[PDB]
RNA sequence: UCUGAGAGUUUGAUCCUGGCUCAGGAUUAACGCUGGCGGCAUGCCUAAUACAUGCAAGUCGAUCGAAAGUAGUAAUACUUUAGAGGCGAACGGGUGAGUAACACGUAUCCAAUCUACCUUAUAAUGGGGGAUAACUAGUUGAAAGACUAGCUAAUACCGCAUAAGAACUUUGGUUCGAAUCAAAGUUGAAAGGACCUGCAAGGGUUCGUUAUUUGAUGAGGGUGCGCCAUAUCAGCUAGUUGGUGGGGUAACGGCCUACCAAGGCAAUGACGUGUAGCUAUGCUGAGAAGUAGAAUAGCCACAAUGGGACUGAGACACGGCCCAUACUCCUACGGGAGGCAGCAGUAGGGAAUUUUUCACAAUGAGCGAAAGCUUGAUGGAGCAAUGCCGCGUGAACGAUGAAGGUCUUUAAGAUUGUAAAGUUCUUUUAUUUGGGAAGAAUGACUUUAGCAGGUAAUGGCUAGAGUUUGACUGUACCAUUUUGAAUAAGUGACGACUAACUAUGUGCCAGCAGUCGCGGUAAUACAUAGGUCGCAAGCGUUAUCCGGAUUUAUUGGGCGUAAAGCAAGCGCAGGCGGAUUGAAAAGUCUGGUGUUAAAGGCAGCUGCUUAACAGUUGUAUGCAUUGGAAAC
């Protein structure tokens, strides 16, 4: 599926907000309990190495919305490069257009960035992109010619800008550019990329 | 020829104009994409000179590129 | 369709055998019934098919629930 | 069938009768040489070989081999 | 042959694409494939397409819808099955009442007061009855319209088991059915015929001569209407007996009415 | 350093010998449920089973006479060819029945070969004859046609002059079955067409001809290696094993003939049998390898079946021929006609594998100075979730959480669920409007500039010319291009492995079933409702290849009680083999070189929306020659 549908429902069982904390933290209350009418006490009756591996992988693609075939595509792409493949893959994990736009102060959510990108409001280097999965590279210019005045969302994101060294942006001129590869310390550390690359040899 | 639909390609070959294409070749000389005309090729004109010395006339429209190689300046006028 | 008169099973609740019913089968062994390694697809050219199931109706061919 | 095969037939049938005549007269010359050995029929075969090998009627190798064999067996006479 | 059945079904697929008004039924009991037709020429042309257009060679017979079975005045017998087939001992024994019920199907009434049969065995024995009536000693049709009243029984030690009681009840049911002179029931259709004037006496004499239950006249606005409860076998050729006499200007409505007692003549005909 | 993850499973229990199952991939994939679409291909594997229809390989009039028709008073010019003459036809495409072997691939040998059209290289490109084609008239029938007699053309056919050069003959002169030269003997060379020029003479262009020498191409021939299993298949073999002569093939060759003999092979497995198109390679594993030889590419076999011949450089010729076979069709019944393993399409089969679709736009192939013609190749386009890649069905905020429902089991709460309602916004796609391609940086075409032997001049050639070529395509996509959340999500599992259970029904029955196994009275195992979770326009099921399985274990296992030691000895061949000295290096390693096509992957680059993919670049096994190495 291109979208998880309900995203707070994803944080229900996971217990982790895809936002900083405010996803299921301020909507009336904080519902961080796992779903299920069969709910009961569960403290160490459902967690295992296989289960934690699934949890890490699941939150990893939830943060980016990668389908299985695209997931293997990205895996092969990071195979195409050498070094510590886990951290290099994690650097490639930011190479999503919607993720960058969210991190560029141009969209409050990556979901909104994806749906702007498909709508055609984005200009990627003199080439409007409707596919939000294109791979970022350093030194790319973007424009928002005219489908931005009628969008309050992009302006609201522009005033709530994001500071990042790996990219540059003029939010008041609707300008963004990918500068350098991201740093691991700027990104959440609860994810373990090693177990997944061990899990991906099954072709 | 090869490539994709809406994406033609044909590697230029000094092949016998009487024997079919897409087979064993004595020597492949150049390549070109006829979709977008920009004249990118890897012509040699070294063994092609020998091929023309022993006939080996390439396909129909190669003569135009032969004009670009300027072999007419060095092949047909080489007896005077 | 050729001359191979072999055993089979009817998987699922009920049956639609007509003593001449033309239908489709399934290849797979069953442990409790020795000599029997075959089934019948529910809903192929003779069998009715069963709906209102989050279960089979992917197998045991039956149309998607209509509401 | 097709018209092209009809035209090829209408041509090569007569060309083949002609070639049959030429081959049979060459055969007759070979016969007359087999009867007795002389320079006159040697010249006759010399001429006929050039008459027939000129076209595709007789292969050059066959004519050369036969004339070489006949002149070789003549060399002892 | 069963292969002939399959090839005739292929011919059915070919012949149903032109006009599917003909109905085809494969009966679960009589077994023979019933195919509907208009008349002599209609069936003839179907046969012609089958043998010549379709190259399908199939034998032709007679329509098949047979009967139902029941039995006479009540009686009470016992069932004792002390037997074994496979590795150890088996035993069972029950005592039931075999009573007819003209307007009700299988019915069970218990008479266990002294603990002769535990409640666990109350239900299986019923099933033993429900499967035992399926066969008849005359022609083998299931026996219906019967009231069953279990009276007594005996549950022994490990030799006793529920299916043994079911088999004993089956023995009792068959024995009592043999004793109580079983009888047969034939299907009866209610046929209504509306004719202006022409075939009043013709239909009267046809029904009187062939078979049927009749009572006089109905006088509709400008026509004569006759309803007959007639055995379904009597429709054989009646479709053309009436039509030939009516020159093709006949019509009726065929509706099933009920199963009725078979006379002695029917008892002599159908049996082998 | 290229590079390796298992799980459960007997029993009171423990492992062990050891089987099983699946977790993983792949697949011409098939089926179910469903299903907007982009881009990338592919899309009979069943019956070489039988087929209507169309194309399917034809071209040249400036090769030839003449015919028909137009214009023109006529001559003549022009339009088409009924035909001849020249060439293509053997290209190419498709199939895998056959074939278990020079067939593939590979290294080399052809002291034993050939190879129009295209390369080099020269000699010239005459003198005639005599014929027919076409046609005319007659005969036979509806007609196809067939038969008979008359007239002729051809760069057609056949003699006649010389043969430069070759080849043969003979003599002299060469080389480790060879090759080269000289002289003499003999033989046989062409055909003309068009154009320019020239009063003419004649000259030139150009096409073609003949013979000559030389490329290349393709074919044939020689072997070595590699190229299934079968000994519950041990003898086979008389053209068989060789020799002499001859015929014979482009050459050698019992290939064949006459004569002469009786060998030859085969236990390291012939023959017989069934199974088979082969390779590069697709996929599975780290690999040794397995899988199958998809499609494509190279090679071989076939063209309804068995032969046989036919010209032609080249065929025993998909779509040439005769016979015979078998079939089909027409016949107004006398006789004929044909072969989709070509494009499709059609019938059967299966679960199933698609359009008798368009243009020859490009490419290519053929014919032709030329224009121009053919081109069911080719390129497209149609269809199919068949695989691959890619995208939506909304999005910003938004509640102690709307309504209903569920559990809790009347009580709260959770729960469905930021999902909802609500405000706001948007439009790739749905859909109106205009733009909008390259593909043709080719090809034709004449005058110019120039080159060029000639020059009297056209023509031979290179740089610019436009009238020239688009099915694809006013196409994809794009300026809120019109409006608009509007045009759209299912599937499986939820006892464990395997991250996924509550309520109800239920009674070893109903049924699930990959295994362990569940269900006989409240089943987290079945069936429904709800909920959970995972993948997703795919998810479920089946088959089959592999990983897991190293579980026929050189690599990478054992033989005592499990499966394993013949009951033992003699015991050939073969295998393994005491020490020391030498050489060769046969084996081996290694250096130089060549070859091992492309395409496959590994990596870099480029074009793609990153993307699969296409192109660019290189990467390699293996074999042969030559120089060494000396340990074994």
Structure, described:
The structure is cut from a larger assembly and holds chains A (203 residues), B (80 residues), C (67 residues), D (77 residues) and E (272 residues). Chain B is of the alpha+beta class. Helices cover 19% and strands 8% of the residues of chain B. Chain B is built from two helices and two strands. Chain B is globular and about 50 Å long. Chain C has no helices and two strands. Chain C has a two-stranded antiparallel ribbon with strand order 1-2. Chain C is globular. Chain D has one domain (1-77). Chain D has helices spanning 3-35, 39-53, 60-75. In chain D, helix 2 (39-53) runs antiparallel to helix 3 (60-75). Chain D is elongated, with a radius of gyration of 16 Å. Chain E has 272 residues and is an alpha+beta fold. In chain E, strands 3, 8, 9, 10 and 11 form a five-stranded antiparallel β-sheet that branches. A four-stranded mixed β-sheet of chain E has the order 4-5-7-6. Chain E is flat. Chains in contact: C-E. Chain C binds chain E through residues 18-20, 22, and chain E through 2, 5-6, 9, 26, 28, 31. Chain A binds one RNA strand of 632 nucleotides through helix 1, helix 2, helix 3, helix 6 and helix 7. Chain A: This is Small ribosomal subunit protein uS4. Chain A: Part of the 30S ribosomal subunit. Contacts protein S5. The interaction surface between S4 and S5 is involved in control of translational fidelity. Chain A: Residues 95-156 form the S4 RNA-binding domain. Chain A: Keywords: Ribonucleoprotein, Ribosomal protein, RNA-binding, rRNA-binding.
Number of helices of chain A: 8
Helix content of chain E: 25-40%
Strand content of chain E: 25-35%
The radius of gyration of chain A is 18 Å
Tally of contiguous helical segments of chain E:
7
Spatial shape of chain E: flat
* N-to-C SSE string of chain E, H for helix and E for strand: HEEHEEEEHEHEHEEHEH
Beta-strand share of residues of chain A = 5-15%
Oligomer: part of a larger assembly
Given the helix and strand composition of chain A, which structural class is it? mainly alpha
- Spell out the CATH superfamily of the largest domain in chain A: Ribosomal protein S4/S9, N-terminal domain
The biggest chain-chain interface is: C-E, 4 and 7 residues
CATH architect. name of the largest domain in chain A: Orthogonal Bundle
How would you spell out the order of helices and strands of chain A? HHHHHHEEHEEH
Q: What spatial order of strands do you see in the largest sheet of chain A?
A: 1-2
Structural class of chain E comes to alpha+beta
**Text of the CATH class of the largest domain in chain A:** Mainly Alpha
Tell me the number of strands of chain A. 4
Percent helix of chain A, as a range, is 25-40%
Query: What's the Cα radius of gyration of chain E?
Result: 25 Å
Function (chain A): One of the primary rRNA binding proteins, it binds directly to 16S rRNA where it nucleates assembly of the body of the 30S subunit.
GO molecular function (chain A): rRNA binding; structural constituent of ribosome
InterPro entries (chain A): Ribosomal_uS4, Ribosomal_uS4_bac-type, Ribosomal_uS4_CS, Ribosomal_uS4_N, S4_RNA-bd, S4_RNA-bd_sf
Protein name (chain A): Small ribosomal subunit protein uS4
């Amino acid at each position: 599926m291109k979208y998880t549908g309900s995203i707070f429902k994803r944080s229900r069982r996971l217990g982790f907000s895809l936002l900083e904390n405010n996803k299921e933290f301020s909507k009336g209350k904080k519902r961080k309990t796992i779903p299920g009418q069969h709910g009961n006490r569960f403290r160490s009756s459902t967690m295992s190495g296989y289960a934690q591996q699934l949890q890490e992988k699941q939150r990893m693609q939830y943060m980016y919305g990668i389908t299985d075939k695209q997931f293997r595509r990205l895996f092969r792409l990071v195979l195409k490069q050498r070094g510590n493949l886990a951290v290099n893959l994690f650097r490639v994990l930011e190479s999503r257009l919607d993720n960058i736009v969210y991190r560029m102060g141009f969209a409050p959510t990556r979901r909104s960035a994806r749906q702007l990108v498909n709508h055609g409001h984005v200009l990627l280097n003199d080439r409007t992109v409707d596919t939000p999965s294109i791979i970022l590279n350093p030194g790319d210019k973007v424009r928002l010619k005219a489908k931005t005045i009628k969008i309050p969302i992009v302006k609201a994101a522009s005033e709530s800008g994001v500071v990042s060294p790996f990219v540059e942006t003029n939010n008041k001129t609707f300008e963004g550019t990918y500068v350098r590869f991201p740093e691991r310390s700027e990104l959440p550390a609860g994810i373990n990329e090693s177990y997944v690359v061990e899990w991906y040899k099954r072709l | 020829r090869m490539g994709r639909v809406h994406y033609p390609t044909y590697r230029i070959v000094a092949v016998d104009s009487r024997v079919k294409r897409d087979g064993k070749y004595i020597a492949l000389i150049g390549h070109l994409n006829p979709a977008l005309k920009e004249n990118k090729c890897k012509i040699d004109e070294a063994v092609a000179l020998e091929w023309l010395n022993k006939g080996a006339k390439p396909t129909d429209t190669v003569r135009s590129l032969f004009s670009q190689t300027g072999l007419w300046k060095k092949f047909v006028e080489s007896k005077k | 369709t050729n001359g191979f008169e072999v055993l089979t099973y009817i998987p699922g609740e009920g049956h639609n055998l007509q003593e001449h019913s033309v239908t489709l089968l399934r290849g797979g062994r069953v442990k409790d019934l020795p000599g029997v390694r075959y089934h019948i697809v529910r809903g192929t050219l003779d069998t009715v098919g069963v709906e209102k199931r989050r279960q089979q109706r992917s197998a045991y061919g039956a149309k998607k629930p209509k509401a | 069938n097709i018209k092209s095969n009809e035209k090829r037939l209408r041509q090569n049938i007569k060309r083949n009768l002609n070639n049959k005549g030429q081959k049979t007269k060459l055969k007759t010359n070979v016969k007359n040489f087999h009867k007795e050995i002389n320079l006159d029929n040697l010249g006759n075969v010399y001429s006929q070989a050039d008459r027939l090998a000129r076209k595709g009627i007789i292969s050059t190798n066959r004519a050369r081999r036969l004339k070489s064999r006949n002149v070789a067996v003549l060399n002892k006479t | 042959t069963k292969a002939d059945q399959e090839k005739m079904s292929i011919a059915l697929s070919k012949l149903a694409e032109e006009d599917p008004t003909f109905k085809t039924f494969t009966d679960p009991e009589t077994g023979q494939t019933i195919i509907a037709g208009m008349g002599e020429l209609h069936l003839d042309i179907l046969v012609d397409r089958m043998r010549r257009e379709f190259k399908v060679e199939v034998n032709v017979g007679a329509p098949q819808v047979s009967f139902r079975e029941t039995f006479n005045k009540e009686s009470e017998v016992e069932g004792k099955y002390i037997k074994q087939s496979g590795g150890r001992g088996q035993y069972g024994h029950v005592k039931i009442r075999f009573e007819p019920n003209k307007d009700k199907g299988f019915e069970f009434v218990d008479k266990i007061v002294g603990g002769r049969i535990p409640r666990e065995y109350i239900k299986p024995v019923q099933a033993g009855l429900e499967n035992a009536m399926a066969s008849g000693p005359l022609a083998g049709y299931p026996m219906i319209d019967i009231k069953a009243t279990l009276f007594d029984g005996s549950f022994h030690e490990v030799d006793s088991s529920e299916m043994a009681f079911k088999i004993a009840a089956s023995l009792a049911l068959k024995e009592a059915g043999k004793v109580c002179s079983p009888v047969l029931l034939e299907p009866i259709m209610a046929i209504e015929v509306t004719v202006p004037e022409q075939y009043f006496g013709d239909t009267m004499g046809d029904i009187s001569s062939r078979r049927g239950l009749i009572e006089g006249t109905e006088q509709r606005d400008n026509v004569q209407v006759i309803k007959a409860k007639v055995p379904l076998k009597e429709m054989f050729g009646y479709a053309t007996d009436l039509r030939s006499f009516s020159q093709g200007r006949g019509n009726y409505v065929m509706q099933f009415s009920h199963y009725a007692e078979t006379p002695k003549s029917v008892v002599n005909e159908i049996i082998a």
